[PDB]
Design a protein around this ligand. Structure first.
Ligand SMILES: *[C@@H]1O[C@H](CO)[C@@H](O[C@@H]2O[C@H](CO)[C@@H](O)[C@H](O)[C@H]2NC(C)=O)[C@H](O)[C@H]1NC(C)=O
Ligand code: NAG
Ligand code: NAG
Ligand code: NAG
Ligand code: NAG
Ligand code: NAG
Lengths: 187, 49, 49, 206, 302, 50, 49, 44
């Protein structure tokens, strides 16, 4: 009943409970009132900054993410790799490709503000109708799937706590060799 | 007929490589034998700081 | 169900003892009776006018 | 509010017989070797195959512990509603019988709310007179849900343990005494109510 | 015909209702900015054993040392060792040496924590809910011919649709195999999938997501999230040269760029949705015991 | 005290650029001044952690 | 609800406590009393509260 | 030779998978009952 209780509380210790490293998206109340333990920001002078600046319920994070605005996203990758950050706000498929690059970079579960990347264009111009028709012609065929095959689709043990116990077992065997030789000298 | 094209250095989308010998590129293949048709762009090394 | 059966019975409990405490506080006699139907009351159209 | 074990039993009834034939082919005793095989699977190459089968017996009883833990720990019967945000009540069916007292405040409160008109059209074919009718109908499983205040349902949960409330608490309202118009019995009667609030007479009524 | 026949012929002003966007519809009118991501979709129904072997040889060598000090348990200590890992209580051997008793006690403590950790490993494998799929793309080998596989299945779209035109401009042979497999109604195809009068169905993405979010049982499961699909959007169709187009585009960008569109999607969607099974493990059990009796038949030559 | 633009929009509106072919987040405010095309990529916002 | 790690734990949910409410303090005999009361009754009984 | 009521020490002694030698069972009824009780002890 001792070893059954020990099996029960090790299953309590490493199966059910979990250190909540996840954020569960923008609706985390601990990030609504952040601190020095929650270092998170975005790219300096982006559309996401203005999108959070218009919304009055995202002002407090706007008072926080303004403290560490970065120039490029690779700066954010190097910062969160060197533990200078704790969370980063970015779009989906770029972070999916970088998760295919680096396995430690793990995204979250929620998904909001389903926006779109296009082509920045001028005013009334002859490069408006024909260009959009060319984009739609690229949409209708299998060229978008080929573009996904270029970069989007193309991706790149039980020794937790008893490993030290196993090492102490091996050291106890090594010391027990000399103890048994002392017992041989005893009789 | 000539259209000015400008972009930002996106990490999975805009790959920038230095020239091999003199204003040239390295014609490499993908995993399916497709040669990456590069382009000769002009840009700075880093930002103003 | 009931053609004519309206009798005095015994009532007690929570709000009854609350009203007994109120009658201990404020000086008044009472007449405890019950509602005829089993409804709270809604602003519903009567069938005429 | 099994068959795989029979297959393993037929397999080991083949295995023990063929291992006894292997032991006979390798140079009272028959039943003793059978009983030794019985002691092998449950609490010299035939001994090697028997200890490999004992490894299989440990992984089978470990899988049995694992799938009974699957059978009782993680799974949970879907008997809960979790309040007003249930898609069972937003989209009712024939087995989703919910109602309230006929001509109550719930009717007006869901008649003003125009997005709650589905429940207004559903409960009107199911409205009953008294709450005891609702208790008698839900005891015979004619009902499935009942929108009601907390105190009566908690008292009936103390009476009948099968009656179980849900988790969400919506429309926090108050019950007072039905009073008339402008009258001198409005002020100090309410002061007596506040005097009942300030002391432990509410705790005595609890 | 339809809304295109009403808007282009100037009997209707604009198409506020939902509409698929393709080439010739963008030729006849001018669509607005998109507001929802609505593509298309198809609905259907190595280090433990090595170190344990090394420590097995170490335990056997210590048993050989105890035998060299002080009845035939030289190599037969392995039969006591790996046999008593599994705690099935097979009568094996009664050792007299204190060294062997202490070594087997340390090995048994390691076996107790090993079986506890293995039950924890089975619980950790028991946490996850696996996901299985049948068709993994629009270019499936099932989609080449249903005679190529053993069940001849069936696939359908909605009649007279722009999806049918997209198929006829992408795969005319798919239209030829669909000509034998036509149907009429969306809910008719839903009942055909539930009862079993249809195998798979080809439609848009988010409408089937709304139909699956309200469905009882959640039996019909989508495939992917628009990865091997069209991945287009819905907008508002106006007549060519309408002066109201830019203001409607700015109003749509305001309705998306405030979080109110997410509240409207939350209002008009639903974000909802065992027993014993070890048949792969049991097949591995039978294959390993077949390999064991094969190795015994190899060793029977002496 | 005058509001201006910079970056790709600053090079575009000054005449130094003619066509920004870049995966830019299409939003409300940047379309208030210039015309945009239909987007090719569609994705939402998410949080990267370690 | 804003506690760092839910360290401080409340006791009960208003059972052996005062169990009172909040109101808007007005002067005695104010004509704005009934309008504010009906506005609060509208603000509670629509899901907006 | 002593299994009158001493088999309780084999009954409740071999519930717990202790690998301690206790007694050599000779009765067939005893061995079948120990097998059924051992399955009962595993599920217990
Ligand atoms: C309690 O209720 C009674 C009846 O409404 C009232 O008490 C009278 O109050 C006046 C002052 O306004 C006193 O002069 C009287 O002596 C009180 N009693 C009598 C004999 O009429 C009043 O509403 C409340 N008074 C208190 C004590 O709170
Ligand atoms: C652009 O589109 C129109 C309509 O299809 C076509 O007539 C024209 O030739 C195209 N070419 C230009 C002007 O770029
Ligand atoms: C009261 O009503 C019930 C049902 O109508 C009837 O059966 C019963 O006789 C009545 N009892 C009395 C005491 O009036
Ligand atoms: C009872 O009524 C009389 C009327 O004169 C009043 O004076 C007295 O205060 C009342 N007592 C109580 C208990 O209020
Ligand atoms: C008038 O008709 C309605 C129909 O529902 C009914 O509920 C109501 O009781 C009737 N009024 C009277 C006075 O009976
Ligand atoms: C599809 O269009 C044809 C005419 O081309 C029509 O006869 C048929 O009824 C339509 N399909 C439907 C709505 O079943």
């Amino acid at each position: 009943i001792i070893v059954a209780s020990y099996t029960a509380n090790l299953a309590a210790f490493l199966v059910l409970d979990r250190p909540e490293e996840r954020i569960t998206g923008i609706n985390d109340p601990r990030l609504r009132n952040p601190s020095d333990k929650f270092i998170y920001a975005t790219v300096k002078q982006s559309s996401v900054d203005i999108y959070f600046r218009r919304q009055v319920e995202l002002s407090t994070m706007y008072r926080h993410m303004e403290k560490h605005n970065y120039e490029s996203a690779a700066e954010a990758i190097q910062a969160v790799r060197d533990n200078k950050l704790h969370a980063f706000i970015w779009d989906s498929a770029v972070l999916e490709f970088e998760a295919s690059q680096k396995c430690d970079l793990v995204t979250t579960g929620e998904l909001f503000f389903r926006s779109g990347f296009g082509i920045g264009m001028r005013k009334d111009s002859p490069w408006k109708q024909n260009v959009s028709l060319s984009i739609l012609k690229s949409h209708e065929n299998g060229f978008m799937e080929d573009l996904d095959k270029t970069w989007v689709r193309y991706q790149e043990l039980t020794f937790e706590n008893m490993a030290g116990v196993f090492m102490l077992v091996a050291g106890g065997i090594v010391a027990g060799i000399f103890l048994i030789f002392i017992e041989i000298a005893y009789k | 007929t000539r259209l000015k094209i400008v972009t930002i250095h996106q990490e999975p989308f805009v790959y920038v490589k230095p020239t091999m010998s003199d204003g040239t590129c390295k014609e490499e293949f993908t995993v399916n034998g497709d040669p990456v048709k590069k382009v000769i762009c002009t840009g700075p090394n880093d930002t103003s700081p | 169900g009931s053609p004519r059966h309206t009798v005095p019975q015994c009532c007690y409990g929570f709000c009854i003892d609350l009203l007994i405490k109120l009658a201990r506080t404020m000086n008044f006699t009472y007449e405890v009776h019950l509602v005829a139907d089993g409804k709270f009351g809604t602003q519903e159209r009567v069938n005429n006018s | 509010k099994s068959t795989l074990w029979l297959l393993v039993g037929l397999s080991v009834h083949v295995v023990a017989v063929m291992l006894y034939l292997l032991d006979r082919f390798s140079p009272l005793t028959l039943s003793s070797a059978m009983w030794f095989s019985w002691g092998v699977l449950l609490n010299f190459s035939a001994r090697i195959l028997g200890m490999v089968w004992a490894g299989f017996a440990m992984i089978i009883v470990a899988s049995y512990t694992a799938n009974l833990a699957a059978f009782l720990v993680l799974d949970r019967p879907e008997e809960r509603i979790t309040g007003i945000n249930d898609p069972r009540l937003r989209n009712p069916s024939d087995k989703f019988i919910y109602a309230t007292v006929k001509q109550s405040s719930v009717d007006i409160y869901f008649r003003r709310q125009v997005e709650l008109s589905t429940m207004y059209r559903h409960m009107e074919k199911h409205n009953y007179e008294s709450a005891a009718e609702a208790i008698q109908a839900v005891r015979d499983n004619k009902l499935h849900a009942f929108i009601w205040d907390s105190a009566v349902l908690e008292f009936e949960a103390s009476q009948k343990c099968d009656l179980v409330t849900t988790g969400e608490l919506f429309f926090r309202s108050g019950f007072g005494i039905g009073m008339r118009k402008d009258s001198p019995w409005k002020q100090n009667v309410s002061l007596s109510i506040l005097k009942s609030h300030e002391n432990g007479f509410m705790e005595d009524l609890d | 015909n339809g809304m295109i026949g009403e808007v282009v012929y100037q009997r209707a002003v604009m198409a506020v209702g939902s509409l698929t966007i393709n080439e010739e519809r963008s030729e006849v009118v001018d669509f607005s900015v998109p507001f929802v991501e609505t593509g298309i979709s198809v609905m259907v129904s190595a280090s433990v054993w090595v170190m344990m072997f090394v420590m097995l040889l170490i335990v056997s060598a210590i048993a050989v040392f105890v035998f060299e000090y002080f009845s035939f348990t030289i190599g037969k200590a392995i039969w006591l060792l790996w046999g008593l890992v599994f705690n099935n209580s097979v009568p094996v051997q009664n050792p007299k040496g204190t060294t062997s008793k202490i070594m087997v006690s340390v090995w048994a403590f390691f076996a107790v924590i090993f079986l506890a950790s293995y039950t924890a490993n089975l619980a950790a494998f028991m946490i996850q809910e696996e996901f299985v799929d049948q068709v993994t793309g629009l270019s499936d080998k099932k989609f080449q011919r249903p005679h190529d596989y053993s069940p001849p299945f069936r696939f359908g779209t909605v009649p007279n649709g722009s999806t049918e035109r997209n198929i006829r401009n992408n795969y005319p042979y798919m239209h030829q195999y669909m000509t034998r497999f036509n149907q009429r109604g969306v809910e008719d195809a839903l009942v055909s999938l539930k009862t079993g009068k249809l195998d798979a169905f080809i439609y848009d993405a988010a409408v089937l997501n709304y139909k699956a979010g309200r469905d009882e049982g959640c039996k019909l499961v989508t495939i992917g999230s628009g990865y091997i699909f069209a991945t287009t959007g819905y907008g508002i169709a106006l007549q060519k040269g309408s002066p109201w187009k830019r203001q409607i585009d700015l109003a749509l960008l305001q309705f998306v760029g405030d979080g109110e569109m997410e509240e409207l999607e939350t209002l008009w969607l639903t974000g909802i949705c065992s027993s014993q099974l070890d048949i792969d493990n049991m097949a591995g059990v039978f294959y390993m015991l077949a390999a064991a009796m094969a190795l015994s038949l190899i060793t029977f030559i002496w | 005290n005058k509001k201006e633009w910079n970056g790709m929009m600053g090079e575009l509106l000054s005449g130094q650029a003619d066509m920004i072919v870049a995966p830019l987040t299409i939003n409300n405010e940047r379309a208030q001044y210039i015309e945009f095309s239909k987007p090719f990529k569609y994705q939402g916002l998410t949080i990267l952690v370690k």
